[PDB]
Amino acid sequence: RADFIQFGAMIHGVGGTTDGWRHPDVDPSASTNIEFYMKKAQTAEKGLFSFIFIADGLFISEKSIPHFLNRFEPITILSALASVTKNIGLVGTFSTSFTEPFTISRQLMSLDHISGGRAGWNLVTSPQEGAARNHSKSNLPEHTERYEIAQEHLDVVRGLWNSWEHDAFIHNKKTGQFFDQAKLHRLNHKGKYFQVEGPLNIGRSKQGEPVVFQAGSSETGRQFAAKNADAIFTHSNSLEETKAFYADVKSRAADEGRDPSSVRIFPGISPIVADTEEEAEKKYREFAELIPIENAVTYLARFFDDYDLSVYPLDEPFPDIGDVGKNAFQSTTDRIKREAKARNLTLREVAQEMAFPRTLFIGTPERVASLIETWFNAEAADGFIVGSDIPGTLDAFVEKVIPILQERGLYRQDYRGGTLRENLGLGIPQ
């Protein structure tokens, strides 16, 4: 592999779980704490990370996780972070389902100008049915139609980004010609879902226009990402699954007539790094133990529930519960029984691990760096998006894993440049 691996940092307030915020080290106000976001962003920039990433959603209930209840909105926090960072990308989730493309186009391009060409857009078709009812709609469109809407939305956004050629603004004080009128282009778009005349009232950025990220995993979504995205998010459930996703999406991109190397695949990992195997495992256990055990056992009960687990002593080995009642959830139950027997887990531990599974990327910096290199060399990844809910795991990753990857020649010593496109290794499409 002639290329270097890249990382993004997902900054996610008090985190992705129901009860992680209860750890002594967590600031339960993190999700609306500007200092927290700034510190995390600057830590990722110290690690030469290609970008930070702000995930988003548009509907909550009393049962939504704490981070989702009360948090920053993405374009605003990214713009605030632009002023206190230098080279790191600024990638935010925005939905195609509700907001007009002119608005999204303008806000992303303005962020691109504020930041000197670091903006990115994680394009999502909102999957949250209730979000429709926050935006004056009775219901969401069906899955397939959501991706039709998204294609038109994206086409308009990119069309509007190209309203002005890169050299349109000649600013000639002597002649009074502020712009070259031949370099201005109206979109004049009249489609099924959007009608947008243009032109956009902001020109090209220092990277041309923002970078597009996408996370589709269905048949439709994978094809949409391969057709449209500069970078693609995916999961890291197993090396084998992630390798297959990578190859499939790269093949789709070729089918769409693109160079597959122009499509950068980033699986998400949440590594737990510590100086010893035992210290990392301790940190995992500290977090896994936070879940109210009754809630975890009840959720565990799902995969069995031919039994009442509240009979069994929590601190005795997981019972030999087992009845093939169809394959109702038997692919999982078999997995659960295996791991419980393999590591002699108690009922309590099984419940805790099901509520908060143990990452593969746990242990010493050398181990975690080696696994990352293995996934990279196996073409499971062009980089990773790194979650850091557990306090200190971003710091530990930057301080201890990055230098190993640098020493091994898999990671740069310095930022490639000042724009997101340059640091991802992409060109500017003007």
Ligand X SMILES: Cc1cc2nc3c(=O)[nH]c(=O)nc-3n(C)c2cc1C
- SS3 at position 324: coil
C-alpha distance from residue 404 to each of 266, 348, 407 (Å)? 20, 37, 5
* 32 interacts with ligand FMN by CB under 6 A: no
Pick 57 or 418: Cβ nearer ligand FMN? 57
Within 10 A of 281 (CB to CB), how many other CB atoms are there?
15
Pick 172 or 201: Cβ nearer ligand X? 201
Least separation in angstroms between residue 58's CB and ligand X is 7
Contact residue for its own copies among 129, 254, 277, 292 (CB under 8 A): 292
Least separation in angstroms between residue 51's CB and ligand FMN is 12
Least separation in angstroms between residue 151's CB and ligand FMN is 13
Nearest to 162 by CA among 219, 129, 113, 200: 200
The two structure tokens encoding residue 331:
């692919």
The annotation status of 217 as a binding-site residue, yes or no, is yes
* 81 interacts with its own copies by CB under 8 A: yes
Q: How many residues bind ligand FMN (CB under 6 A)?
A: 18
Contact residue for ligand FMN among 172, 177, 218, 332 (CB under 6 A): 218
Interface residues for its own copies in 4-63 (CB under 8 A)?
19, 21-24, 28-29, 32, 34, 38, 57-60, 62
Q: Which residues contact 161 (CB under 8 A, 6 or more apart)?
A: 105, 109, 200, 204, 208, 209, 210
User: Which partner, ligand X, ligand FMN, its own copies, none, binds residue 110 by CB below 5 to 8 Å per kind?
Assistant: its own copies
CB burial of 385-394 (b: ≥16 within 10 Å; e: otherwise) equals bbbbbbbebb
Least separation in angstroms between residue 384's CB and ligand X is 12
By the criterion CB under 6 A, which residues form the site for ligand X?
55-57, 68, 128, 268
Could you say which DSSP state residue 272 is in?
E
Could you say which DSSP state residue 172 is in?
B
Q: Are 214 and 229 spatial neighbours (Cβ–Cβ below 8 Å)?
A: yes
Which range, of 23-31, 53-61, 131-139, 176-184, touches ligand FMN by CB under 6 A?
53-61
* 235 interacts with ligand FMN by CB under 6 A: yes
For helices 277-288 and 347-355, give the axis angle rounded to 10 degrees: 90
Helix-, strand-, coil-residue percentages of the chain, each rounded to 5: 45, 15, 45
Least separation in angstroms between residue 308's CB and ligand X is 32
Pick 176 or 409: Cβ nearer its own copies? 176
Q: Are 387 and 16 spatial neighbours (Cβ–Cβ below 8 Å)?
A: yes
Chain positions contacting ligand FMN, by CB under 6 A = 55-57, 93, 122, 124, 127, 215-218, 220-221, 233-235, 268, 385
| Residue list for the binding site for FMN | 56, 93, 143, 147, 217-218
| Residue list for the binding site | 56, 93, 143, 147, 217-218
